[PDB]
Amino acid sequence: SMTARPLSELVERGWAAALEPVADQVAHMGQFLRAEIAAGRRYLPAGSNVLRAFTFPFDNVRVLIVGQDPYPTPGHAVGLSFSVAPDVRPWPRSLANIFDEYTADLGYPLPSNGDLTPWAQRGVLLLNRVLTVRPSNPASHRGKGWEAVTECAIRALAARAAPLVAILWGRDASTLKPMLAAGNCVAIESPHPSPLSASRGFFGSRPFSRANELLVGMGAEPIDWRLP
Ligand SMILES: O=C(O)c1c[nH]c(=O)[nH]c1=O
Numbered sequence: 001s002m003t004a005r006p007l008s009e010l011v012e013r014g015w016a017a018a019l020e021p022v023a024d025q026v027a028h029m030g031q032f033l034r035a036e037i038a039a040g041r042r043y044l045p046a047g048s049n050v051l052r053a054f055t056f057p058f059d060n061v062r063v064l065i066v067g068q069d070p071y072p073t074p075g076h077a078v079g080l081s082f083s084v085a086p087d088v089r090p091w092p093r094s095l096a097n098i099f100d101e102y103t104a105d106l107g108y109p110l111p112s113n114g115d116l117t118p119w120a121q122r123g124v125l126l127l128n129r130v131l132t133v134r135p136s137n138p139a140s141h142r143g144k145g146w147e148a149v150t151e152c153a154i155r156a157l158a159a160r161a162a163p164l165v166a167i168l169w170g171r172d173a174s175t176l177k178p179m180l181a182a183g184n185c186v187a188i189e190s191p192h193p194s195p196l197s198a199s200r201g202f203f204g205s206r207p208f209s210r211a212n213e214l215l216v217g218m219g220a221e222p223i224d225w226r227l228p
Contacts, residue, residue, distance in 0.1 A: 001047050003030025010051050014058030018156030022149045026051075029145050033132065043132045043141070044070050045077035050131050052079030053120070054153070061157055062123035063211050063223050064166040066150070066173040068192065069130040072138050080126040082193075084114035097193040097202065102225070105208045111227035122224055127153065129172040142172070151179055158182040163220035165211045169193060169202070186214050 007016040007023055019026065033050075036043050045052075070077035071092055076084050082095055091099070091114045099110055120126055129150050134140035154176045157164055164185040168174050170192030180187045190205035191197045212222035 001030070002050065003027050003034060011054035012057050015054035015153075018058050019054065019149065019152055022152040025145055025148045025152075029131075029149065032144055036134070042135050044072065044074065044135055045079045045132075049077070049079030053081065053125055053127050056120045056125070058156070059160075059162070060123045061125045061160075062163060062165070062215060062220055064125050064127060064154070064157065064164065065119075066154075066166065066168050066176060067128045068170050068172040069128050069139060069141065070133045072133050072136050072140075074135055077133070079131075080116055080120055081128045083116035083120075083126060086113040086115040088114055093195050094193050097195065097198045101193070101203060101205065102208060102227075104204065105206045106225055108226055116227070118227060119223070119225070124223055125157070129176065139172075147175075151176060154179045158185040163215060163218035165214045165218075167207045167211060170197065184218070188214075 002010065007019055007026065011019065033043055033047070065081060067081040071084070073092070075088065076092055078085055082098055084092065084095060095114045102108065103110060116126060127150060130141050130144075130146040131149070132141045132146065158180055166176070166180050166185065166187040168176060168187060168189050174189055177187055177189065188205070188207050188210055190207060191200040191202045193202045208223070208225045215222050
């Protein structure tokens with residue numbers, strides 16, 4: 001797959017072009033992971049899900065949501081940031097809190113499940129700064145080569161002749177703020193929704209309505225945030 005096949009196959013045609021400057025660095029990340037299995041350590045999510053955020057069209061992205069790194073618990077990380085498979089409960093405490101802020105912000109009721117597939121299908125890019133994690137070790141793949149990719153991805157978005165709003169959750173996500181120096185690309189910066197940091201100003205941050213206020217301001221269409 002990842003070290004084996006070129007971007008033209010792994011991601012959507014628009015992303016494959018945007019991420020051309022890190023084609024090798026993606027190849028390299030393929031190698032790093034094979035070495036992790038060889039050494040007898042695992043990673044999350046499954047090889048086929050690592051790049052999933054980029055299987056939705058690059059040209060369609062209106063909003064960017066950026067976490068730190070994938071759910072450390074087996075059966076959680078699906079390769080879209082904060083999403084879980086529809087049949088997963090309890091929701092990770094991180095998602096539960098994203099949903100409290102979601103009901104508070106937008107008025108809407110609690111989603112049925114934790115599948116955020118719909119946000120992705122509507123122009124929300126669900127990214128982590130880092131695309132893999134060793135199971136049960138938050139931040140274990142920090143500075144292993146993923147940063148250059150998620151930075152390239154963000155630069156390519158901001159370069160687009162397109163409106164962009166960026167929601168950056170936590171310090172690792174905020175390090176992408178400089179590449180969003182572009183004036184056709186505004187940024188919402190709040191603490192991470194994880195319990196450790198949520199009380200620190202995630203709660204009441206109102207990112208969803210504010211994102212939509214900013215999109216309307218750039219003559220772009222709001223995101224339909226509404227989840228089944
Ligand atoms: O930034 C984060 O904490 C997360 C980002 N993406 C996920 O899939 N899970 C998380 O917990």
